[PDB]
Symmetry: C3
Subunit: 123 residues, 3 copies
C-alpha cells in the first residue's frame, strides 16, 4: 500500500455551535444519529461535534473533495477504548474506490477554542 | 514505499500579513508568481498565502530542514477541483532525492485566525 | 509496511505553563531530564515543552491510548540539525510491539498561543 491522500481541518468551536443553533436541520445534515450521542447515551457536546465535522472535512480533502459526497456517508465511530474510527459508505465509499483506498486513519483534538482532525487514506 | 518524513505548521494569519506589508520584497522571496494568483487571475488573499507558507515550512520539516533550501523551489499548485499539490525543484528536489522521496501529500486549512498545513513525504 | 496509527494534538501554551507552575512534580512526571534541556544546556521554554507534551499525546493516540502508558517511556530527542525524533521504551514500546509498529514520524509547531504535534506509526 501507499498513501493516497491526506486531509487536515481546523474548526472554530464557537462558530460551529452558532451554525448548529441557527438552523435546527443542520445537525441531521452533517451527522448520523449515532454520532450525536456519547457512548452512555447522552447528547454529544459542541466541541466533540466540531471535531467530527473537522474529520469529515479532512476526509473529503483526502479524497480531493469531489461534488456529490454526502456528510452522512462518512461515519465517525468509537472503539471501547475511546479511539475514533472512520466508516465510509455510499458516495464516500464510491469515491474512495475510484482512488483505490483500502484503509482509513483518523485522529481528533480540541483545545484553545478549536477542534482539529487529520485523516490519512491508504491503499 | 515507506514514510520518509512528516511536517506540520501553524501560522498566525494577521502576523503573516503584517510581515508581508512590512517588507515589499518578502512575497517574492517566499512565493512564485503563480502562487500569488487565484485560478481566475485575482490576487491571492493573506490567509491563503499563509496556508501556502505553512505548507512550505511543513515540507521543509518533512525533509529535516537542511540549510540551503529555497522557498521558490517548492511550489503549491492547484488541480481543477481545488486540491492543493506540491511540486519540488532545484534545492528542495535535491534534498528529497538524498532521502529517497518519490511522492508528496499535502493538505491545508485555515480558521480561527490561523492557517495550517500537513505534509507527508513518501518513497 | 503500512500505517498503523496517526495522532494529532493541540495544546494551549498558557494553560500548559500554568499546570506546570501549579504542581512542581508535574514536569518530572511528563518529561525525562533530557527533554527539559535545550541542546546548549539551558532550560527548555514552556511553548517547546507544550509541543513535546502534544507529541506524547499524539503518540498515545496513534497507539489507541491504552491504560498503563508512562509519559517517561516516550522520549523526544533532537538531531544536530534540529529535527525532533521519538524514542520509545518500556510500556510504550510494548504497546507499539502489540500493534507491530516499526517506525515513528513526528513533527512539531507552535504559534498563536498553541503548540501542535502530528505523529504517524508505521510497520
Ligand atoms: C474544499 C473544502 C473541503 C475545504 O473547505 P473549508 O473547510 O471550508 O476551508 P479550509 O480552510 O479548512 O480548507 C480550504 C483549503 O482546502 C483545500 N481544498 C480546496 N479544494 C480542495 C479539494 N477539491 N480537495 C482537497 N483540498 C481542497 C485548499 O487548499 C483550500 O485552501 P486554499 O483555497 O487557500 O488553497 C470544503 O469547502 C468542501 O467542499 N467540503 C466538502 C465536504 C464534503 O464533501 N463532505 C461530505 C463527505 S464527508
Ligand atoms: C525549523 C523550521 C522549519 C521551523 O520553524 P518555525 O515554523 O518558525 O517554528 P515552528 O514552531 O513551526 O516549528 C519549530 C519546530 O520545528 C522543529 N524543527 C526544528 N528544526 C527542524 C529540522 N531541522 N527538521 C525538522 N523539524 C525541525 C522543532 O521541533 C521545533 O520546535 P522545538 O524547537 O520546540 O523542538 C524553520 O525555522 C526553518 O528553518 N524553516 C526553513 C524553511 C525552508 O527551508 N524553506 C525553503 C524550502 S520550502
Ligand atoms: C485520550 C487522550 C489521548 C486525548 O485526550 P486530550 O489530549 O486531553 O483531549 P484531545 O481533545 O486532544 O483529544 C480527545 C480526542 O482523542 C480521541 N481519543 C479518545 N480516546 C482515544 C484513544 N483511546 N485512542 C486514540 N484516540 C482517542 C477522541 O477522538 C477524543 O475526542 P472525542 O471524545 O470528542 O471523540 C488522553 O485523554 C489520554 O488518555 N492521554 C494518554 C497519554 C499517555 O498515555 N501518555 C503516556 C505515554 S506517551
Ligand atoms: Mg475547514
Ligand atoms: Mg512554524
Ligand atoms: Mg489534547
Amino acid at each position: 500500500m501507499s498513501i493516497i491522500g491526506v486531509g487536515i481541518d481546523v474548526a472554530e468551536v464557537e462558530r460551529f455551535g452558532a451554525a448548529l443553533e441557527r438552523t435546527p436541520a443542520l445537525a441531521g445534515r452533517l451527522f448520523l444519529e449515532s454520532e450525536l450521542l456519547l457512548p452512555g447515551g447522552e447528547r454529544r457536546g459542541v466541541a466533540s461535534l466540531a471535531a467530527r465535522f473537522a474529520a469529515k472535512e479532512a476526509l473529503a480533502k483526502a479524497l480531493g473533495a469531489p461534488a456529490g459526497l454526502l456528510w452522512t456517508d462518512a461515519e465517525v465511530w468509537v472503539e471501547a477504548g475511546g479511539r475514533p474510527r472512520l466508516r465510509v459508505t455510499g458516495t464516500v465509499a464510491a469515491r474512495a474506490a475510484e482512488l483505490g483506498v483500502a484503509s482509513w486513519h483518523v485522529s481528533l483534538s480540541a483545545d484553545a477554542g478549536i477542534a482539529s482532525a487529520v485523516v490519512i487514506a491508504e491503499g
